[PDB]
Design an enzyme around this catalytic site. Structure first.
Site, short mmCIF file in Angstrom:
data_model
loop_
_atom_site.label_atom_id
_atom_site.label_comp_id
_atom_site.label_asym_id
_atom_site.label_seq_id
_atom_site.Cartn_x
_atom_site.Cartn_y
_atom_site.Cartn_z
N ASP A 1 51.54 0.98 7.01
CA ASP A 1 50.82 1.54 8.27
C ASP A 1 51.04 2.92 8.12
OD1 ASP A 1 49.94 1.91 10.96
OD2 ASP A 1 49.79 -0.20 10.84
N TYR B 1 30.58 1.56 10.54
CA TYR B 1 31.38 0.57 10.44
C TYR B 1 30.82 -0.54 9.42
CZ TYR B 1 34.70 -3.17 11.73
OH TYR B 1 35.86 -4.13 12.06
#
Ligand code: ZN
Ligand code: ZN
Lengths: 257, 261, 261, 257
Positions: free
Chosen positions: D43, D168
């Protein structure tokens, strides 16, 4: 009327059109006659088909046809050869579009209504295509070896079926899915196979509508049957279109209801 | 380890078509081994009876033509008689003939196209409408769920080969139905999913010359072999467990994209 | 005969990217021959200048990197300066490299994947956002239409071959954009469509050994040849005319389904 | 815990998971640890990732990673090999999901926001897959020759993008479209490649929601991240799943707004 180099000719080509007494099939029939083609109108409704052929003139003939019948399909091909000597294009427009829930208050969806929708929409389209292909294969090879074009009608229901459209969606998804295996085979004969998936058009097919129409992004209206016929015209002329399903729907994506 | 789930398949009742062989036989074995009850449906009485016998007291067989209104209703009633309820329907019954549009002996027969449609598409709809009617009576379970219907399409719905007009039409029809049926049956908490298998080791395939079977396996990128029916059944099991799967067609095919021939 | 239409392309203004060669050059020729004005955009100044010169007074060229904010704005302004408006954008600029995920010399370069995405996907979005902004100012024409945007994906968006991760990603991104952009731009009467070409006779293809070109043509069911750029341009012309085409990706590919190799 | 014959083993397999500090990636990390696997959490957010690794225990490690960075991607692979000696599964969950119109009052969609969404969602996913594939190819061949599994995350926006989702949708459609060419190539190494296209899940990703959730036919709720992880688990175990995009969405078909 401007065309690309190596466009396929539409003038003097013989079109066989199902569902030709109304709606989309009637529009294709008009388009083809006005473009200098010959048309054999096929419909189960003799009153509608005879009127359409009369209105179009000597470039048109009518042959009453139940597209799901082997005998009637063969007679339709024979009628076309008797009148005009050949077949170049088949456009399958005959269809029915009932709405019936899988589960209603009065019971499960009737099996017979599902079977009938499949019979007319899917079996009928296959019946006409197999017989038209057999006739087209007898043509001399045209530009690039092309002998014919077969155009089927699916629906946006093949993609976005609403509540109540199990039968319709199954039938039209079946039409759509056939395009490729049929194109793959008929390539050796120079016969192209394409499918148009219309959205909502102004025809008797969907005889709620206003709400569906309001959900069409652009243009915010029902389709004009001549716009479906325009796409048919372009598929005939553009040799690179083969094996594909084209949505003609104003970017509609139907909601569940 | 555990498999995260809503529907717990133990003591739930599966109705499975084509259950005498191949994929449906594998689903029946999977379900019994997971503690479910199974009602096997097939036109092949010999195969169906032997399968139910091998599976034991958690299984029953009823000879059934899935395209028949009468037989479909009799099958539902038989399941309710034996086990009191229906939780899952898996439609595996199908035929996969090859026949060219334009053959050496003439155009494709209309009758053979019609039969393939009848068994594969009409039969699947017939069983789903009747199973859904029964499921709709169930008490809602975990997350409101009353039942799951899983249909079998095929990669032929996507990449149909020469000779597959009828098979592709029928399986494309099954695939396209999934959404409108799921949208409606959501109101009853009944999910509807479809699996599109690639090339599996079914009875028809097993009957082909080895050289042929081997060429078919070689067309599959990975794993470069025929699928095992238990792998199809494992996906069926996952769909039952995974409540978020709904309204979708899943390809189970080793990344196969069938060529024209 | 006539072609049924809403938008009449005579005296309307096309902005075309990749216009120095191949598909974009063919669109530019089609549009001028139909009475439209054309603004050719390309990074290749030599090719773009020669194309505009050959086409005559209805054409202009501006050297443009489609992935550049600055150059995109300059291109719009150049079109407005020359011809007063923009009616149609056709995005043809693209690159189609092949590079394996795992090559002999190591993993696929990140930089090359990024470049392909940049030109093919980011460049197409950049030109569409700026053209849409200009089109939104137009007086509504037939049926409320202010403009048409046509993008170029590829069959690689559907059937990507070994080596096509970057190309397939970029063209799949173009394809997937069509709907959300069409849904929004409908409010301005601007349609958005995508063509997914198969194998066409472009500069890259023409440069390949004949034996290679011939094998590629042989993979196409019918017509069993490379596509002519004018056939792509003919479909572009039809999309402009046919107001009901919106939000869709059309395969123009001779029924090609590319194999892995 | 009942498995089919010839199922692939998950126990003692090493998972590399991006976006692992939250949402779907956090759920996959938990699922894998609880199933007896090792996990390297990746992450960009060190606080979230360190907390997740701490909560999971000694089967987990955290490596701070910008998935779009060549250097950081290589370091993530190296961290996994240092800790656990191999890589078996990559699950790409890192993503951003902004909404921005092509045309707003204050102007055209910014080019930089489109580029950033592409960079994280699409370039980042490719970066991790190329490097994980290279590591997986070094494994000895397992059952049926299998060396690894790569699972990417698309979205229903790849199919049904709403107004405001150009970036997106482009990014996630790009992910989806890659699945096949990558699977085709990596087959020679026994590495399967699959994509999951989630609908609406209860995660920070979409931080209007209620309306979207109400449009989900069944189940009529947001997805649980553990249901996404369950599908990941099944893909790992079921060797016949390859080259495919699976919608995990409760039959949602997003409306334009
Ligand atoms: Zn014409
Ligand atoms: Zn497991």
């Amino acid at each position: 009327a401007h065309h690309h180099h190596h466009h396929m000719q539409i003038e003097n080509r013989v079109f066989l059109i199902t569902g030709a007494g109304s709606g989309l099939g009637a529009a294709v029939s008009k388009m083809a006659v006005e473009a200098g083609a010959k048309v054999v109108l096929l419909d189960v409704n003799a009153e509608a088909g005879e009127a359409g052929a009369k209105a179009l003139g000597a470039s048109a003939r009518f042959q009453r046809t139940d597209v799901a019948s082997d005998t009637d399909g063969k007679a339709a091909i024979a009628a076309a050869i008797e009148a005009f000597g050949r077949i170049d294009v088949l456009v399958n427009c005959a269809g029915v579009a009932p709405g019936e829930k899988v589960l209603g208050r009065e019971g499960a969806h009737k099996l017979e209504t599902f079977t009938r929708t499949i019979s007319i929409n899917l079996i009928g389209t296959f019946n006409m295509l197999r017989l038209a292909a057999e006739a087209m294969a007898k043509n001399e090879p045209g530009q690039g070896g092309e002998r014919g074009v077969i155009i089927n009608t699916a629906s946006v229901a093949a993609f976005d079926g609403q509540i109540g459209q199990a039968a319709y969606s199954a039938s039209k998804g079946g039409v759509a899915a056939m395009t490729l295996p049929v194109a793959r085979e008929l390539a050796r004969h120079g016969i192209r196979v394409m499918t148009i998936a219309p959205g909502i058009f102004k025809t008797p097919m969907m005889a709620v509508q206003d709400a569906l129409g309001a959900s069409v992004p652009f243009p915010p209206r029902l389709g004009e049957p001549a716009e479906y016929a325009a796409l048919v015209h372009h598929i005939v002329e553009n040799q690179m279109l083969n094996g594909e399903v084209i949505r003609l729907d104003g970017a509609l994506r139907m909601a569940a209801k």
